[PDB]
Design an enzyme around this catalytic site. Structure first.
Site, short mmCIF file in Angstrom:
data_model
loop_
_atom_site.label_atom_id
_atom_site.label_comp_id
_atom_site.label_asym_id
_atom_site.label_seq_id
_atom_site.Cartn_x
_atom_site.Cartn_y
_atom_site.Cartn_z
N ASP A 103 0.83 -1.23 0.00
CA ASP A 103 0.00 0.00 0.00
C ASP A 103 0.86 1.27 0.00
O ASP A 103 0.26 2.35 0.19
CB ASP A 103 -1.00 0.02 1.16
CG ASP A 103 -0.39 -0.21 2.53
OD1 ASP A 103 0.83 0.06 2.68
OD2 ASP A 103 -1.17 -0.57 3.47
N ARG B 49 0.95 6.78 -0.11
CA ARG B 49 0.15 5.81 0.66
C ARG B 49 -1.25 5.70 0.06
O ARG B 49 -1.94 6.72 -0.12
CB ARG B 49 0.11 6.26 2.12
CG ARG B 49 -0.75 5.39 3.02
CD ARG B 49 -0.21 3.96 3.15
NE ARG B 49 -0.82 3.24 4.29
CZ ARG B 49 -2.02 2.65 4.27
NH1 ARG B 49 -2.77 2.66 3.17
NH2 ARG B 49 -2.46 2.02 5.34
N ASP C 121 -5.74 -1.05 4.09
CA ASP C 121 -4.66 -1.56 4.97
C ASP C 121 -4.24 -2.93 4.45
O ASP C 121 -5.07 -3.86 4.45
CB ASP C 121 -5.13 -1.58 6.41
CG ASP C 121 -3.98 -1.82 7.38
OD1 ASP C 121 -2.89 -1.33 7.10
OD2 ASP C 121 -4.25 -2.36 8.42
N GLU D 107 1.31 -6.38 7.13
CA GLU D 107 2.77 -6.18 7.18
C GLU D 107 3.45 -7.34 6.46
O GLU D 107 2.86 -8.43 6.45
CB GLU D 107 3.21 -6.11 8.64
CG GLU D 107 2.58 -4.94 9.37
CD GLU D 107 2.78 -3.64 8.62
OE1 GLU D 107 3.92 -3.15 8.61
OE2 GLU D 107 1.82 -3.17 7.95
N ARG E 291 3.78 11.47 3.29
CA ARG E 291 3.32 10.60 2.19
C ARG E 291 2.13 11.24 1.50
O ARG E 291 1.21 11.75 2.17
CB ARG E 291 2.99 9.19 2.68
CG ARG E 291 4.15 8.51 3.38
CD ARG E 291 3.82 7.13 3.90
NE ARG E 291 2.72 7.13 4.85
CZ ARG E 291 2.18 6.05 5.40
NH1 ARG E 291 2.68 4.85 5.19
NH2 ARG E 291 1.11 6.17 6.18
C1 THP Z 1 -4.07 5.67 4.83
C2 THP Z 1 -3.85 6.82 5.82
C3 THP Z 1 -2.91 6.70 6.83
N1 THP Z 1 -2.66 7.73 7.70
C4 THP Z 1 -1.74 7.52 8.83
C5 THP Z 1 -2.55 6.99 10.03
C6 THP Z 1 -1.61 5.98 10.64
O1 THP Z 1 -0.91 6.65 11.70
P1 THP Z 1 0.09 5.85 12.72
O2 THP Z 1 1.41 5.77 11.95
O3 THP Z 1 0.22 6.83 13.87
O4 THP Z 1 -0.49 4.52 12.97
C7 THP Z 1 -0.63 5.59 9.53
C8 THP Z 1 -1.00 4.23 8.98
O5 THP Z 1 -0.23 4.00 7.79
P2 THP Z 1 0.45 2.58 7.53
O6 THP Z 1 -0.64 1.51 7.48
O7 THP Z 1 1.22 2.76 6.24
O8 THP Z 1 1.39 2.30 8.69
O9 THP Z 1 -0.81 6.53 8.50
C9 THP Z 1 -3.37 8.95 7.58
O10 THP Z 1 -3.20 9.89 8.40
N2 THP Z 1 -4.24 9.11 6.57
C10 THP Z 1 -4.55 8.08 5.72
O11 THP Z 1 -5.41 8.28 4.84
#
Ligand code: THP
Length: 129
Positions: free
Chosen positions: A15, A29, A34, A37, A75
């Site tokens: 992703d 991103r 989701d 991992e 991102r």
């Molecule tokens: C997909 C997405 C992730 N995020 C942030 C929330 C999550 O914060 P945390 O890092 O604090 O968990 C993280 C999850 O991305 P990943 O699944 O790539 O780790 O990215 C956003 O803020 N907006 C979004 O649309």
């Protein structure tokens, strides 16, 4: 929403992808998904799926939603298309991602992806197996 040009710089994982957008390198991103991992079940298969879709594409496009265009890590947040096929949707349709991170105002394709998830779950694909 509008599709905008980009070029692949490199695959990263299920992703996230590194693209050149308006001539600048960015990590994107994928909105509304989701993927597990790499060390979780279907992590490597999701990476491989996204890698093949973006590497085999003649034309990559970025589609921003109506809300935040970058996250707190810098991102890019977008729907990514490979020769007109949405990577976000395709992951969910194949049971390699869950619909997730549905924030108000960046959720234009939420119902499209939830329909894909319901079909993947009905077919018991991958994460739903
Ligand atoms: C997909 C997405 C992730 N995020 C942030 C929330 C999550 O914060 P945390 O890092 O604090 O968990 C993280 C999850 O991305 P990943 O699944 O790539 O780790 O990215 C956003 O803020 N907006 C979004 O649309």
């Amino acid at each position: 929403l509008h599709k905008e040009p980009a070029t692949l710089i490199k695959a990263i994982d299920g992703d996230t992808v590194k693209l050149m957008y308006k001539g600048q390198p960015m990590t994107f991103r994928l909105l509304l998904v989701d993927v597990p991992e790499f060390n979780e079940k279907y992590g490597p298969e999701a990476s491989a799926f996204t890698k093949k879709m973006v590497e085999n594409a003649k034309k990559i496009e970025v589609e921003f939603d109506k809300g935040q265009r970058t996250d707190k890590y810098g991102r890019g947040l977008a729907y990514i298309y490979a020769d007109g096929k949405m990577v976000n949707e395709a992951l969910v349709r194949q049971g390699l991602a869950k619909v997730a991170y549905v924030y108000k105002g960046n959720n234009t394709h939420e119902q499209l992806l939830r329909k894909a998830e319901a079909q993947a779950k009905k077919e018991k694909l991958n994460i739903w197996s």
